[PDB]
Coordinates of C-alpha atoms and ligand atoms in Angstrom, one line a residue:
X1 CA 1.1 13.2 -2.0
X2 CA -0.2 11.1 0.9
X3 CA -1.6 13.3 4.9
X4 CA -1.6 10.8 7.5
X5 CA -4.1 12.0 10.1
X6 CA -3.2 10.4 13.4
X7 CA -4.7 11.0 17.3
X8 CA -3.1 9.6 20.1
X9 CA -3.4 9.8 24.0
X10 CA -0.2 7.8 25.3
X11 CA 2.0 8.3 21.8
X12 CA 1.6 4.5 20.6
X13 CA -0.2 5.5 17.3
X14 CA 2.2 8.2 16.6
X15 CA 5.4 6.3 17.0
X16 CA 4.0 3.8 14.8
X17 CA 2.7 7.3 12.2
X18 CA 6.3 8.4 12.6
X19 CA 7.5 4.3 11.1
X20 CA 4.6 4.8 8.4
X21 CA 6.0 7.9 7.1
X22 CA 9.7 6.9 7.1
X23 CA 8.8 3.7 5.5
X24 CA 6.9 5.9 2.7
X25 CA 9.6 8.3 2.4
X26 CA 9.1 11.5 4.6
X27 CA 9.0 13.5 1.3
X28 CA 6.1 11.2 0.2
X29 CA 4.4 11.6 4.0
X30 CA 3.0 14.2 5.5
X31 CA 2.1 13.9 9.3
X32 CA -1.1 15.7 11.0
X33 CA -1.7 15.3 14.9
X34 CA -5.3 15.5 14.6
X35 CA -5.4 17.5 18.1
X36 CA -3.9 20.9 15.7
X37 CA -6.0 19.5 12.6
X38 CA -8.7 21.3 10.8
X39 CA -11.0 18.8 8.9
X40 CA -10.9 20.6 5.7
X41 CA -7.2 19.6 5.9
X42 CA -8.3 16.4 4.9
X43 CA -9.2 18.1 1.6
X44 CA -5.7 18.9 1.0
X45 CA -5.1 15.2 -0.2
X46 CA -6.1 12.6 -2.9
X47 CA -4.6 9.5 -1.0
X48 CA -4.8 9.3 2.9
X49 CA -3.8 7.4 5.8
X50 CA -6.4 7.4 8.9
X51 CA -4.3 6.5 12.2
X52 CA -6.5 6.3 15.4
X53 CA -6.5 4.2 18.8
X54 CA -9.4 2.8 20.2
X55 CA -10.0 4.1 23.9
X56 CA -12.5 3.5 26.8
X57 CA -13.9 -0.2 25.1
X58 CA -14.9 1.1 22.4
X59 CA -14.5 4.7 21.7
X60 CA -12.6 6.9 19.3
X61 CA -9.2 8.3 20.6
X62 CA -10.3 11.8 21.9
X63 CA -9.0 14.4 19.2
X64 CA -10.8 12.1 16.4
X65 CA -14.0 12.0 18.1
X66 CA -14.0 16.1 18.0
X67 CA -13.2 15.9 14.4
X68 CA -15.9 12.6 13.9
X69 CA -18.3 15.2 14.2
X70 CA -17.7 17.1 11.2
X71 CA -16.4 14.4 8.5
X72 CA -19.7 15.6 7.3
X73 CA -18.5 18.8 6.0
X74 CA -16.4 17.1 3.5
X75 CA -16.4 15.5 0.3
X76 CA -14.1 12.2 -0.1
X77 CA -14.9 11.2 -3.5
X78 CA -12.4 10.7 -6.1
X79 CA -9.8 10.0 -2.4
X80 CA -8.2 6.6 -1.5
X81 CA -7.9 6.1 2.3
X82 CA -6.0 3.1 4.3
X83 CA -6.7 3.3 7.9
X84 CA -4.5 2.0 10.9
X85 CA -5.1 1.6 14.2
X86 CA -2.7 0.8 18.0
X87 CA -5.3 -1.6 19.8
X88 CA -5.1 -4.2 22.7
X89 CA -6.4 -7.4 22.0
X90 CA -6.0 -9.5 25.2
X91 CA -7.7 -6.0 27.3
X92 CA -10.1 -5.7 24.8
X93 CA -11.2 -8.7 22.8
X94 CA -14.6 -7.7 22.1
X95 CA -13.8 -4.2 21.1
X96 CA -10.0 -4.8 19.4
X97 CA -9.6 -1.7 16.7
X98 CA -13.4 -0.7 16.9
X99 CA -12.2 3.1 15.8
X100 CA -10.7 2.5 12.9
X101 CA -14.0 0.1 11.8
X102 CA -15.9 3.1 12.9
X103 CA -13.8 6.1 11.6
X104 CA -14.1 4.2 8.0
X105 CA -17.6 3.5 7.9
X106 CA -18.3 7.5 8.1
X107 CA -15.4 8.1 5.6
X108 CA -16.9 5.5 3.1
X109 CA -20.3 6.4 3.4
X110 CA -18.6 10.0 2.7
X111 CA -17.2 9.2 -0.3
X112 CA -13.5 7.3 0.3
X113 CA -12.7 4.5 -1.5
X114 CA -10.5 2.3 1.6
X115 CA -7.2 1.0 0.6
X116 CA -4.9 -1.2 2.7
X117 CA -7.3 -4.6 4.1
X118 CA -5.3 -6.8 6.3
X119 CA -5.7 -10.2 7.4
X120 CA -7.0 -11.1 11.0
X121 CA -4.4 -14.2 10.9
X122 CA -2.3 -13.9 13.9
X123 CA -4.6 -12.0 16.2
X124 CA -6.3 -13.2 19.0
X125 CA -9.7 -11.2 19.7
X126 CA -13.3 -12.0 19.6
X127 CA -14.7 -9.1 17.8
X128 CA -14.1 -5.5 16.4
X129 CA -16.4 -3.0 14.0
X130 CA -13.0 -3.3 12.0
X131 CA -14.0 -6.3 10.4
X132 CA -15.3 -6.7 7.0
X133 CA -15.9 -9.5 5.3
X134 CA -13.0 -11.9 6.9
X135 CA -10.1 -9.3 7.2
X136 CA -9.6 -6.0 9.1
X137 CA -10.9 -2.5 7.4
X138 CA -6.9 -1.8 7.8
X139 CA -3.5 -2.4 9.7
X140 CA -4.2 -3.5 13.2
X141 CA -1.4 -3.1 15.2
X142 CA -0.8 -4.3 19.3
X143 CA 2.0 -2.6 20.6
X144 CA 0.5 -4.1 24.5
X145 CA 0.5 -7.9 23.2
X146 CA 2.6 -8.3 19.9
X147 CA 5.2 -5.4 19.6
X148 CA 7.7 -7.6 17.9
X149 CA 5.8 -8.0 15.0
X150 CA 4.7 -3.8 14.0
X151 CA 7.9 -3.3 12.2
X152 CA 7.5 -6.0 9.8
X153 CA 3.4 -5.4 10.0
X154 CA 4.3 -2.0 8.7
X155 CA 6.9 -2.9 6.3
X156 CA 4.5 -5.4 4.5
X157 CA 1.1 -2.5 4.5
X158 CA 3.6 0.2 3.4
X159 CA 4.8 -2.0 0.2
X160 CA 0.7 -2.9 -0.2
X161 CA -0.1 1.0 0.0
X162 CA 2.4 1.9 -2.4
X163 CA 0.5 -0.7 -5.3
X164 CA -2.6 0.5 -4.3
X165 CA -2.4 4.1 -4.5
X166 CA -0.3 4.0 -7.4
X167 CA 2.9 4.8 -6.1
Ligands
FMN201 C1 -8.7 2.3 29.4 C2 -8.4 1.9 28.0 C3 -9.4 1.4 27.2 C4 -9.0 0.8 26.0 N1 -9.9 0.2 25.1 C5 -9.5 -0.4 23.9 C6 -10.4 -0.9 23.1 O1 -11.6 -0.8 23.4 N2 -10.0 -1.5 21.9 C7 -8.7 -1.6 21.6 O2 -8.3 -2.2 20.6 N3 -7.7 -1.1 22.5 C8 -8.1 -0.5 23.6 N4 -7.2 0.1 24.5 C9 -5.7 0.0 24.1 C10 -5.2 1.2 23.4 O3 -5.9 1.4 22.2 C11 -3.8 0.9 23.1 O4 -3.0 1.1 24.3 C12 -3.2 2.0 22.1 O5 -1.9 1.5 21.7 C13 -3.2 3.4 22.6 O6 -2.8 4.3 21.5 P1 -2.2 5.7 21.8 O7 -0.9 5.5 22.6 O8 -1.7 6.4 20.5 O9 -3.2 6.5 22.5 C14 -7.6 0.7 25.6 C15 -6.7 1.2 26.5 C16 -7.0 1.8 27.7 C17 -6.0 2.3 28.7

C-alpha cells in the first residue's frame, strides 16, 4: 500500500525509514534503499513516502541524485507523496532539509499531490528550499541536534499520514 523510497550515506535516514515503517505497520510499509531502486519502482505505488538527507550544503544524498535525473520518466498523477528528510540544523542553518524541498518540487511539478506538512516550530535554522508557505514540505528530522524528539516527531506524522492517505 505505501513504498518508502529512502537514500542514506551514514544510515541516519534509514533508521529513522525503519521507525516509519514499524510505526505504519510493516505489512502497510514497504522499504526501498534507493541505491538498488529502479525509478519505475515508484510506479508500483499510489501513496508514497520520499526519505532523503541533505549532503555537501545543499545537495541531494548521493543515490537520490542518480535517480533525480530520471523522475522525468514517470508519471505521479493520481499518487499522494509525504517526504522526510535527516538534516543538521546548527551545521547547516542556511541549507537545513534543502533535499527534500528539492526532491518535491520535481515530484510536484511531475504530478504528486504532497502529503504530510510539518511545522517549523521548534527548529532552529535560517533557511531551507523545504519551506513552503510557513511550514516544512514534510518531516524534518535532526538526529545531530534534537534526537530526543524523532520518536515522538514520527509518532505524531505517522498518525497525520494515516488521515491523509486514507488509511
Ligand atoms: C559534510 C556534510 C554536509 C551536510 N550538509 C547538510 C545540509 O546542507 N543540510 C542539512 O540539513 N544537513 C546537512 N548535513 C547533515 C546530514 O544531512 C545529517 O547528518 C543526516 O542525518 C545524514 O543522513 P544519512 O545518515 O542517512 O546519510 C551534512 C552533513 C555532512 C557531514
Amino acid at each position: 500500500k505505501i513504498g518508502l523510497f529512502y537514500g542514506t550515506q551514514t544510515g541516519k535516514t534509514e533508521s529513522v525509514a525503519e521507525i516509519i515503517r514499524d510505526e505504519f505497520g510493516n505489512d502497510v510499509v514497504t522499504l526501498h534503499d534507493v541505491s538498488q531502486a529502479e525509478v519505475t519502482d515508484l510506479n508500483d505505488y499510489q501513496y508514497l513516502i520520499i526519505g532523503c538527507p541533505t549532503w555537501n550544503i545543499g545537495e541531494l544524498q548521493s543515490d537520490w541524485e542518480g535517480l533525480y535525473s530520471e523522475l522525468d520518466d514517470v508519471d505521479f498523477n493520481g499518487k499522494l507523496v509525504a517526504y522526510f528528510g535527516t538534516g543538521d540544523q546548527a551545521g547547516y542553518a542556511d541549507n537545513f532539509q534543502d533535499a527534500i524541498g528539492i526532491l518535491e518540487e520535481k515530484i510536484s511539478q511531475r504530478g504528486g499531490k504532497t502529503v504530510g506538512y510539518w511545522s517549523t516550530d521548534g527548529y532552529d535554522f535560517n533557511d531551507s528550499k523545504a519551506l513552503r508557505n510557513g511550514k516544512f514540505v514534510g518531516l524534518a528530522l535532526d538526529e545531530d541536534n534534537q534526537s530526543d524528539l524523532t520518536d515522538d516527531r514520527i509518532k505524531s506524522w505517522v498518525a497525520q499520514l494515516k488521515s491523509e492517505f486514507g488509511l
